[PDB]
Design an enzyme around this catalytic site. Sequence first.
Site: not given
Ligand SMILES: CNC(=O)[C@@H](NC(=O)[C@H](OCc1ccc(-c2ccsc2)cc1)[C@H](O)[C@@H](O)[C@@H](OCc1ccc(-c2ccsc2)cc1)C(=O)N[C@H](C(=O)NC)C(C)C)C(C)C
Lengths: 99, 99
Positions: B25-27
């Site tokens: 996960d690059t995000g």
């Molecule tokens: C099917 N759903 C998806 O594919 C979703 N995928 C994910 O959520 C990915 O996670 C895997 C994942 C895959 C499936 C399910 C799933 C759901 C239902 S059934 C399966 C749940 C999780 C994703 O890359 C996260 O990892 C990442 O999201 C981007 C992001 C970056 C910074 C902030 C942000 C927040 C505050 S300032 C910036 C807010 C959001 C994120 O939350 N990053 C965090 C981060 O970097 N925060 C800074 C990290 C700590 C985990 C889509 C719709 C966004």
Amino acid sequence: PQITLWQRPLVTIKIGGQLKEALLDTGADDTVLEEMSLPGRWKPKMIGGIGGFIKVRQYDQILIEICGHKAIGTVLVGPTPVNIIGRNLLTQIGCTLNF
Amino acid sequence: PQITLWQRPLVTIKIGGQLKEALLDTGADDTVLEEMSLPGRWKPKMIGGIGGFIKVRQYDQILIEICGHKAIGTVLVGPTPVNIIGRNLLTQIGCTLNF
Ligand SMILES: CNC(=O)[C@@H](NC(=O)[C@H](OCc1ccc(-c2ccsc2)cc1)[C@H](O)[C@@H](O)[C@@H](OCc1ccc(-c2ccsc2)cc1)C(=O)N[C@H](C(=O)NC)C(C)C)C(C)C
């Protein structure tokens, strides 16, 4: 180009003639952009991620430019804290994860 | 290897002697794993996702193998839908985004 991951992979995208900063997210099935206006009809949808689900509006056949590369696909608009370029569009520009 | 994104970039990881599937996960800034047992003391951490924040347990200097690549770093354990391999570890295995 080759993007390292020492920092968040933020890139400039063009959509609706607007330039925005978005995250290249290989962990995102969909592309989710912050609240904005897009033409056409949309469908309501719930997408989940870390922290739970958010309600977004789904727009199909949306054209987006990612680093010069044009791509077409579904775009979700909603209260996301950051613009996310998901796999649906990353595939269209030939983006691959390498190591 | 080179991973395309037409499907989720799931890989098998080895942690605590067990095999689990995780998402490259690059995000994600951090690596977050589903509820599990890890050694040592943990520190609290709030991480934000698209749906809000969640409390996680932070464990440091944890050995984790990602596709045969040994990595040792910080791992967060919490209410995550899927095991997430974030940039903190992706950088250790020399993973880059290319297009
Ligand atoms: C099917 N759903 C998806 O594919 C979703 N995928 C994910 O959520 C990915 O996670 C895997 C994942 C895959 C499936 C399910 C799933 C759901 C239902 S059934 C399966 C749940 C999780 C994703 O890359 C996260 O990892 C990442 O999201 C981007 C992001 C970056 C910074 C902030 C942000 C927040 C505050 S300032 C910036 C807010 C959001 C994120 O939350 N990053 C965090 C981060 O970097 N925060 C800074 C990290 C700590 C985990 C889509 C719709 C966004």
